[PDB]
Every structure is written in C-alpha cells, then in structure tokens.
Design a protein around this ligand. Structure first.
Ligand SMILES: *[C@@H]1O[C@H](CO)[C@@H](O[C@@H]2O[C@H](CO)[C@@H](O[C@@H]3O[C@H](CO[C@H]4O[C@H](CO[C@H]5O[C@H](CO)[C@@H](O)[C@H](O)[C@@H]5O)[C@@H](O)[C@H](O[C@H]5O[C@H](CO)[C@@H](O)[C@H](O)[C@@H]5O)[C@@H]4O)[C@@H](O)[C@H](O[C@H]4O[C@H](CO)[C@@H](O)[C@H](O)[C@@H]4O)[C@@H]3O)[C@H](O)[C@H]2NC(C)=O)[C@H](O)[C@H]1NC(C)=O
Ligand SMILES: *[C@@H]1O[C@H](CO)[C@@H](O[C@@H]2O[C@H](CO)[C@@H](O[C@@H]3O[C@H](CO[C@H]4O[C@H](CO)[C@@H](O)[C@H](O[C@H]5O[C@H](CO)[C@@H](O)[C@H](O)[C@@H]5O)[C@@H]4O)[C@@H](O)[C@H](O[C@H]4O[C@H](CO)[C@@H](O)[C@H](O)[C@@H]4O)[C@@H]3O)[C@H](O)[C@H]2NC(C)=O)[C@H](O)[C@H]1NC(C)=O
Ligand SMILES: *[C@@H]1O[C@H](CO)[C@@H](O[C@@H]2O[C@H](CO)[C@@H](O[C@@H]3O[C@H](CO)[C@@H](O)[C@H](O)[C@@H]3O)[C@H](O)[C@H]2NC(C)=O)[C@H](O)[C@H]1NC(C)=O
Ligand SMILES: *[C@@H]1O[C@H](CO)[C@@H](O[C@@H]2O[C@H](CO)[C@@H](O[C@@H]3O[C@H](CO)[C@@H](O)[C@H](O)[C@@H]3O)[C@H](O)[C@H]2NC(C)=O)[C@H](O)[C@H]1NC(C)=O
Ligand SMILES: CCCCCCCCCCCC(=O)OC[C@H](COP(=O)([O-])O)OC(=O)CCCCCCCCCCC
Ligand SMILES: CCCCCCCCCC
Ligand SMILES: CCCCCCCCCC
Ligand SMILES: CCCCCC
Ligand SMILES: CCCCCC
Ligand SMILES: CCCCCC
Lengths: 117, 67, 330, 264
C-alpha cells in the first residue's frame, strides 16, 4: 500500500510524496484531468529517476525530478497556458503493470491538486 | 540470374564439406531469429557457403615465463 | 474394452487445434492451480529465484465431451500435442523448462462433461527485483506473473481455481535464509495498446532470517569494539601495549569486513551491514587515535583527563550509535 | 467456421515460401520495435550483458492478403512456421534463445491488407564495450546491433517504427549498480565486401554508482593511511610501538589489497 499526497500549485513546482511500500510501485506518473474531459497523461518517472518520459504535447514545457532519500517527485513547469487549468494527479504503477499512457494500470491515485491559470 | 542466393533451410539437401575445427572443445552457431547460415550458387558451377561460429578453441599455454 | 478406444478416436477426429473453445462465443475462463514442490534458490546477486511446481490449468471444452464412460479419462501425455491448450506463460521468467524423465512430465485428463485438466511440472527461474538497503534486515516481495501471450480478455479470462486455496505447498517450503511470512493471489486486467490482457499474480513475502548475521557479523564486531576500549584502562606510558592493542583491533576489524565481503553476495550499493561495519571501524580508528592525542599531549609537552572521559564517552557513544541504527533499520 | 481454415490454406497455397516480397521491386521496409522487459546482469569479467525483450518485426507482403475478417487474424503453429520472414540476427550476441514454456513465445499477426507482424520474446547475451581504466569511476556504452545476414539494402532495409518511440520500456530497466543515463537508436548502412548492408543499433549509457566503493574501499585505505601518520606524534624513542604501528599498518594495507582484489 502507498499513500500519495500532492502539494503545490510562473516557475511552478508541484510535489508528490509517497508513504508505504513505494519500491513495489517504482513508476510514478503525472496526469491531468480538465473539467469535463477525461484524464490525460503528462509524464512519468522511474525508480532510478533517469530514463524519464513525457507526452508529445508537453514534452518541453515540463520537467520531472526525483529524490528517494526523502522519497518525493517534483514536477516543474516553466511556462503555463490557459488550457492547462485542470486537476493534476500523481499516480503509482507496479513494475509489470502494463503500459504507461493508460490510467487503469495505475493502482494508487493521489487526490490531486487543482491548478487554474 | 547469374548469382542465385539460397535460403538457409534446404542447404542440407546440397552436399557441403565435412570441415570441422580439430582444436575445438565446443562450438555452436546462433539460431535466432533465423539460422545464421547462408549459401550462394553461380551458374559457372561455383558454391559459396558462409556460417557464423564462436569457437572456444583450445590453446596449450606454456606458462613457465608467466607473466 | 475397445469402447474407450473408438470413443477417444471419434473425440480426436474432426478436432480443430487452431481454434479456442467457443471461437465465436464468449471468452473461455481458465482456472489455475499451483503446487509449489520447492523453491530451490533465491539469488540476491542475480535478483531471481528458482521455483519447481505442479502447474495445472482447468478449462471446459465441448468438443472433448463423452458419454457412456463413467470414469475420468487420463490420457497419454503426448495427446497434449493434439488438443488445444492455453498459451500461458510467465511474464517475468528468465528460463524455464518442463521436466522430462522418465517421460515428459505432463498430464491430460478429460472429464465426461468436457472439462480438461492440463498439468505440467515446471522449473522456472523468475525475476525478483529486490530492495537491499536494509540488508540483512530486509523484506522482499517475489512475484510470479502469469499471462496469456496472444489472446486478450475478449478471448479468455484467468481465475484462481479454489480461490485463495488455489496455491498449496507453501507451508512445507523451507529456505536456509528466508521465511515465507505470507503469500497472496491477485487477478487483474492489464491494458496495452493492443488491448486488455488477463493476468494472475502469485506474491511471496520473504523475511530474511538474521540468526546467522548476529553471530557472524554483529557479535564479533561488538566484541572487538569493546576490546578496543581496554586500552583506555591501560597506562598512558605503555606505548607498546596500547599501540599494539589498538592497531591489532583495527587489523581484526579489517579481517572481519573482508571475510564478510568474500562470503556475502556482491550487491554493489550501500546496505545496513556496511553502515554497521564502517561504524565499528570508525570507532576502533578513533580509539587508536585517542592514544595518539594522549601520548602527544603528555609525553611530547592521577588518570589523565582524556582517558577518563574516553572511558565514559566511547561506551556511551557506541550505545547511542547502536540505538539509532537498530531503530532506523527496524 | 471452417471457412477461416480454408482461407488460411488457400492463402498458403501459391505463396512464395522462399522468395522475398517484391523480388523485382524495391526492397522491403522492415520496421523494428522493441519493448525491453529487463536487462539481466552486466559482467565486467565476461564483457557481456543479458537482455530480455519483445522483439517485433513489421513488414508488408501483398502475397498474404486474406479477406473476410478485419480483426487481424493472428496465427501460430505450423502455418506460422513456414511463411517467409526476414533473416534478422543480432551481431553481438554470444548466446541467445527464445522462451519455450508453457508454449513457444512467438506470434505472427496477419492484417487483411497483407501486413505481417512477427513478435518474439527473446533473451540475448549481447556484448558490451567496457573501458575499465577508470573503474569504478567508469561510464560504459552497451549496444545491441541488429543486422541482416544475407540480404543487402537492395533486397531488405531496416528502420525504427515510431522513431524514438519505437524502443519503449527503457524506464522499466532497473539495474542495481548502474544508472541508465540515456538511450539512443541509430540506423545506418554498413559497407561489407558483398555490398551495402542495413544496420540498426540500440545503445544504453550506463554509469556506475560510486557510493559503494567510497564507503568500503577508499575510506578504509584513507583511515589506515592516517593511522600510519599517527606514528609521527609518538615519541622517537618508542621503537616497539612505532615499528609495530608501521609494520601492522603495512600488513593491514596488504590485507585490504589482497582480499579486496578477490571481490572485484
Ligand atoms: C507484493 O507486492 C505487490 C506489488 O504489486 C502487491 O500487489 C498488489 O496487491 C494488492 C492486494 O494486496 C492488489 O490489490 C487488488 O486488486 C484487485 C483487482 O483490482 C483490479 O480489478 C478491479 C476490479 O476487480 C477484479 O475482480 C472482480 C471480482 O472481485 C472482477 O469482476 C473484475 O473483472 C476484476 O477481475 C479494478 O477495479 C481495479 O482497478 C481500479 O479499481 C477501482 C475502481 O473499481 C479503483 O479505485 C482502483 O484504484 C483501481 O484503479 C484493478 O484493475 C482488487 O479487487 C483488490 O481489492 C481489495 O480492495 C478493494 C478496495 O480497494 C475491495 O473493494 C476489494 O473487494 C478487495 O478487498 C486489490 O485492490 C494489487 O492489484 C496488487 N498490485 C499489482 C500491481 O498486482 C502484493 O499485494 C504484495 N504481496 C505480498 C504478499 O507482499
Ligand atoms: C554510445 O556510444 C556509441 C559509440 O559508438 C554511440 O554511437 C553512435 O551514435 C552516433 C549518434 O548517436 C552515430 O552517428 C550518427 O549517424 C547517423 C547515421 O546517419 C546516416 O544516414 C543519413 C541519411 O539518412 C546521413 O545523412 C548520415 O550522414 C552522416 O554520416 C556520414 C557517414 O559518416 C557522413 O559522411 C555525413 O557527413 C554525416 O555526418 C549518415 O550517413 C546519423 O543520422 C546521425 O545524425 C543525427 O544527428 C545529426 C546531428 O544532430 C543530425 O544532423 C542528423 O540529421 C541526425 O539526426 C549521427 O550522425 C554513430 O554512428 C554511432 N556509432 C556507430 C558505431 O554507429 C552511441 O550513440 C552512444 N549512446 C549513448 C546512449 O551514449
Ligand atoms: C471425476 O472427477 C470429478 C471431479 O473431480 C469427480 O467428481 C467429484 O467427486 C468428489 C468425490 O470423489 C466430490 O466431492 C465431494 O463433493 C461434496 C459436494 O460438494 C462435498 O461436500 C465433499 O466435501 C466433496 O468435496 C465432488 O463434488 C465431485 N464433483 C466435482 C465437480 O468435484 C468424479 O468422482 C471423478 N471420477 C469419476 C468416476 O467420475
Ligand atoms: C486491427 O488492426 C488495425 C491496424 O493495426 C487496427 O487499427 C487501429 O484501430 C484503432 C482503433 O480504432 C485506431 O486508433 C484510434 O481509434 C480512435 C477511435 O476510432 C480514433 O479516434 C483515433 O484517431 C485512432 O484511429 C488506430 O489508429 C488504427 N490503426 C492505424 C494504423 O491507424 C484495428 O483497430 C485492429 N482491430 C481492432 C478491433 O483493434
Ligand atoms: C567495557 C569496558 C571494558 C574494560 C575492561 C575492564 C577494565 C577494568 C575496569 C573495571 C570496571 C570499572 O568500572 O572501572 C572502575 C573505574 C573507577 O573509576 P574511579 O572513580 O575510581 O577513578 O572506572 C570507572 O568507574 C568509570 C566508569 C566506566 C564504565 C562506565 C561505562 C558507561 C556505560 C554506560 C553509558 C553511559
Ligand atoms: C552480542 C549481542 C548482539 C545483539 C544483536 C541484536 C539483534 C536484534 C535483532 C532484532
Ligand atoms: C593524525 C593524528 C594526530 C594526533 C595528535 C594531534 C595533536 C594535536 C594537539 C592540539
Ligand atoms: C559511522 C559513524 C560513526 C560515528 C562515530 C562517532
Ligand atoms: C578521538 C577523540 C580525540 C579527542 C581529543 C581531544
Ligand atoms: C573524547 C573526550 C574528550 C574529552 C576532552 C576533555
């Protein structure tokens, strides 16, 4: 079990903190759900913190950093857009769970912060 | 077609030489994703036969002057 | 006597090995049992574990239905090559094989209603990524992931036959280093671009037994660290005795660390045992350097203050170090 | 449902079991996709690493153009064995295999147009270039090379299907002592004696984690060296103490060097 707490939210910096068996769920994925629209995939980070991945739409706007010494994931935005108003979610995924882009493969969801611009 | 490249499967039908490496304790050819052997024929009457091998050939090392 | 013969003959005739049961119908649910014969080894260096098991699959096929034969037909194993069977595979295996002595270890049983029991004796080396930061105080989760290769959830589903009693034999397993605290069964769907695939997961929670390390690593380290403190009670002027004791304690500490490195697995990153060993090493190093301070300060320029304070501080500081270590790593 | 069987049989009949697609035409655009399950082990002794992956070969073949179903009728077993497939092989692999429990890990999907998708779960013991002059501070490039055996660029060409997105699963890679800094995909045409052959390459830049050796190798030696310097503060007329200290520090350094050399 992992409990995910989302905090933060124009050099914005959101944070996701995991408590529990975080090693069992090494991948953390950053998603966003706009009002009305379904949940979109924004980015992902692995256990080592290297070999990241980003969506095509927001590949250059966003950055992801990690620190397992305190077990946190930081999501940095350099530039914001009005269409980005949405609920930002942090989710965890098992090692052999499946593909990154899909939400059902993610077991534990954070309540997710609200960001409006 | 002057050069008929051949598939790696029916080469067993065609006679090939019995060349084996004498000072080899173990050798093999990798079989994936396909066999790593090829053959070619030339209408003049010539056969070419190429394989891939990793031979662990022996070598009697005289270690009296080591290193 | 030949009734069974021609019965099986008509059963196999006109059988399409290409198509699953109910090709145009709903998906066929495949139940699964595992009987863990043994867990042969768990490798921290390779991050995998070998596992021998009887793996059985149950599925209902209407083509293979017979009547007038009130007995379950156990057939020769080679018939498995002639019937349809699921394309099950272990997603995280490194190497696996079905044992083949005296014959291929495989069984087909056909029941009159059409049920098929398909059993194999499989030895598989499954991958178990391990977190070894708390080693030897660690706790690992080793999983076996069972999945279908080509078929998707629209074509099959998996379930654990017998529910939570689907896996048996776990209690009788004995490992030299681990104790199987718990085992768990999970059934889920994994979404890909191609589609949703069924999956079963068999998890084991292994706790590393620490009785070996207490007597091989911790008690020797503690005793050499204590012996290093004996020099605080030796006369300040006994340079030969105190220096010999200190440097030989350092040498003994170095011996224990090298031997453990050679005996233990490689694991090239920091663990708890490394931190404890380096703490003891730093303690003996400081104990030897304390006499350097004493000798210089008194000879170079009734008990001296430094030894008197060392007698209190070194046991005290070592006690706090042990307390912090044992709290943080437990 | 016998009609699907007859469709498969009739598309099999008259199909070139041996001849490549479009022998008189341009070469075949054979795309490649990889989904790395996990790189297993990295031997600094054997100069190799074992890699487990789902190698996927995509190509077009008008001859195998069935009709009737559009759900991508996927095959296995005998008919899947004998249709023509590329001669792709890995150049660096010392030994490799395809997993075979419970069934042979292999699949061949046929699209209605004629496209063929050939998926194989493979474990390959590829070879890696290691410059250990800077070990444990080293930084290696490990490459998997994919090349055609007999066919030149005239007959078969290779490319990455999806560009940089072709090789997914890089994040899944989790090696204990190595950090995967970057990965790269390369497509080139080598020039052998026969002619211009195609080639693809998948490279990983692994960086060793220098925390274990600092803790357990460098600092013991530094502390022993400081303990050797301790003798300069002991009295000049303490021959037993200073000689024992010096010679036993030498003994301890030799012990570290000898036993540590057995562990690397
Ligand atoms: C070792 O470590 C591994 C690390 O991976 C760890 O694995 C996790 O273990 C936990 C259990 O401890 C697993 O949790 C289980 O998942 C069950 C299945 O979830 C999937 O299916 C849901 C729908 O149900 C299934 O079952 C029904 C019949 O019950 C069937 O009809 C369905 O078709 C399907 O087969 C599905 O909903 C779920 O996805 C979403 O679900 C809800 C929305 O419905 C959402 O809130 C979730 O967040 C998720 O996104 C998934 O696809 C699940 O049933 C089970 O549930 C318990 O809790 C819930 C309450 O949360 C109860 O309602 C339910 O009755 C159960 O009591 C549980 O959640 C988890 O999946 C493992 N992770 C992986 C990656 O495998 C091991 O446990 C560790 N083991 C040891 C020994 O250390
Ligand atoms: C690990 O370490 C290994 C060390 O071996 C690294 O290996 C090498 O990676 C580099 C780049 O990643 C490779 O170089 C490249 O070559 C490709 C091939 O391109 C060919 O075809 C093109 C037409 O389709 C043609 O234009 C190219 O022309 C170049 O090369 C020819 C022949 O040398 C030369 O004559 C030309 O003048 C050109 O210089 C070539 O024939 C090429 O496409 C690459 O270019 C990309 O980047 C440039 C600059 O941004 C850009 O302009 C291009 O458009 C393209 O986007 C690049 O030049 C090299 O070949 C690899 N080594 C081997 C042995 O193959 C590995 O990358 C390391 N990886 C990690 C993760 O550390
Ligand atoms: C062929 O196989 C079937 C299925 O395994 C056999 O049928 C089963 O026979 C056993 C007894 O030998 C039955 O077990 C008992 O069932 C009752 C009712 O649930 C339960 O209270 C008892 O505790 C016990 O489990 C079992 O129910 C029955 N059916 C199934 C589906 O298991 C059959 O006997 C075998 N042989 C022949 C000759 O058919
Ligand atoms: C049989 O194989 C074909 C070819 O691979 C599959 O085609 C693919 O179908 C999916 C699903 O329709 C396409 O994805 C997306 O579909 C949505 C919904 O229509 C659409 O809005 C998107 O724009 C997108 O098309 C996918 O693009 C398509 N393949 C290609 C090459 O474009 C087909 O789905 C397979 N059969 C089934 C039922 O999966
Ligand atoms: C583990 C050490 C092994 C050493 C080998 C045995 C050497 C002989 C020591 C005998 C035991 C002893 O306590 O010594 C008594 C002397 C008396 O001191 P003084 O007041 O007469 O100057 O010294 C003292 O009373 C000072 C007290 C030192 C012990 C207290 C350690 C504190 C442990 C708890 C952490 C606070
Ligand atoms: C010499 C006494 C060693 C004490 C070891 C304590 C181990 C605690 C394990 C929970
Ligand atoms: C290298 C250890 C040196 C120990 C003696 C230092 C004496 C300092 C006197 C203030
Ligand atoms: C490993 C840290 C030890 C500190 C002793 C004062
Ligand atoms: C190692 C402790 C030395 C103290 C000198 C004042
Ligand atoms: C390590 C104890 C030092 C005491 C100095 C008076």
């Amino acid at each position: 079990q992992v409990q995910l707490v989302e905090s933060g939210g124009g050099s914005l910096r959101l944070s996701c903190a995991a408590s529990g068996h975080t090693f069992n769920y090494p991948i953390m994925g950053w998603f966003r759900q706009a009002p009305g629209k379904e949940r979109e995939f924004v980015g992902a980070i692995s256990w080592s913190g290297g070999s990241t991945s980003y969506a095509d739409s927001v590949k250059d706007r966003f950055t992801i950093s990690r620190d397992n010494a305190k077990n946190t994931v930081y999501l940095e935005m350099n530039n914001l857009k009005p269409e980005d108003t949405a609920v930002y979610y942090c989710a965890a995924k098992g090692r052999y769970s499946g593909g990154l882009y899909y939400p059902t493969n993610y077991d534990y969801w954070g309540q997710g912060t609200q960001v409006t611009v | 077609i002057k050069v008929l490249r051949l598939n790696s499967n029916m080469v067993g039908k065609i006679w090939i030489p019995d060349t084996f490496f004498r000072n080899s304790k173990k050798a093999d050819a990798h079989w994936i994703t396909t066999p790593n052997r090829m053959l070619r024929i030339w209408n003049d009457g010539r056969v070419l036969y190429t394989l891939r091998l990793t031979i662990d050939a022996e070598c009697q090392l005289q270690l009296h002057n080591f290193p | 006597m030949s009734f069974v013969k021609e019965t099986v003959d008509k059963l196999l005739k006109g059988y399409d090995i290409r198509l699953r049961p109910d090709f145009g119908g709903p998906p066929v649910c495949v139940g699964m049992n595992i009987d863990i014969a043994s867990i042969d080894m768990v490798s921290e260096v390779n991050m995998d574990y070998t596992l021998t098991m009887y793996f059985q699959q149950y599925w209902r096929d209407k083509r293979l239905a017979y009547s007038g034969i009130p007995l379950n037909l156990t057939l020769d194993n080679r018939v498995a090559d002639q019937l349809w069977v699921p394309d099950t595979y272990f997603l995280n295996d490194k190497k696996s094989f079905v044992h083949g002595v005296t014959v291929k270890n495989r069984m087909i049983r056909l029941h009159p209603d059409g049920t098929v029991l398909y059993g194999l004796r499989i030895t598989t080396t499954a991958a178990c990524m391990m977190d070894l930061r708390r080693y030897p105080l660690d706790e690992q989760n080793c999983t076996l992931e069972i999945e279908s290769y080509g078929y998707t959830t629209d074509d099959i589903e998996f379930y654990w036959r017998g529910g939570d009693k689907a896996v048996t034999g776990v209690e009788r397993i004995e490992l030299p280093q681990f104790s199987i605290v718990e085992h768990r069964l999970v059934s889920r769907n994994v979404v890909f671009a191609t589609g949703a695939y069924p999956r079963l997961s068999l998890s084991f929670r292994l706790k590393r037994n620490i009785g070996y390390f207490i007597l091989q690593t911790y008690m020797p380290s503690i005793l050499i660290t204590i012996l290093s403190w004996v020099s605080f009670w030796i006369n300040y002027d006994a340079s030969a005795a105190r220096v010999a004791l200190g440097i030989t304690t350092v040498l003994t500490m170095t011996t224990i660390n090298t031997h453990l490195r050679e005996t233990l697995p490689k694991i090239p990153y920091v663990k708890a045992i490394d931190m404890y060993l380096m703490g003891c090493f730093v303690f003996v190093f400081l104990a030897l350097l304390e006499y350097a301070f004493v000798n210089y300060i008194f000879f170079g320029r009734d008990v001296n203050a430094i030894d008197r304070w060392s007698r209190i501080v070194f046991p005290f500081t070592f006690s706090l170090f042990n307390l912090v270590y044992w709290l943080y790593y437990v």
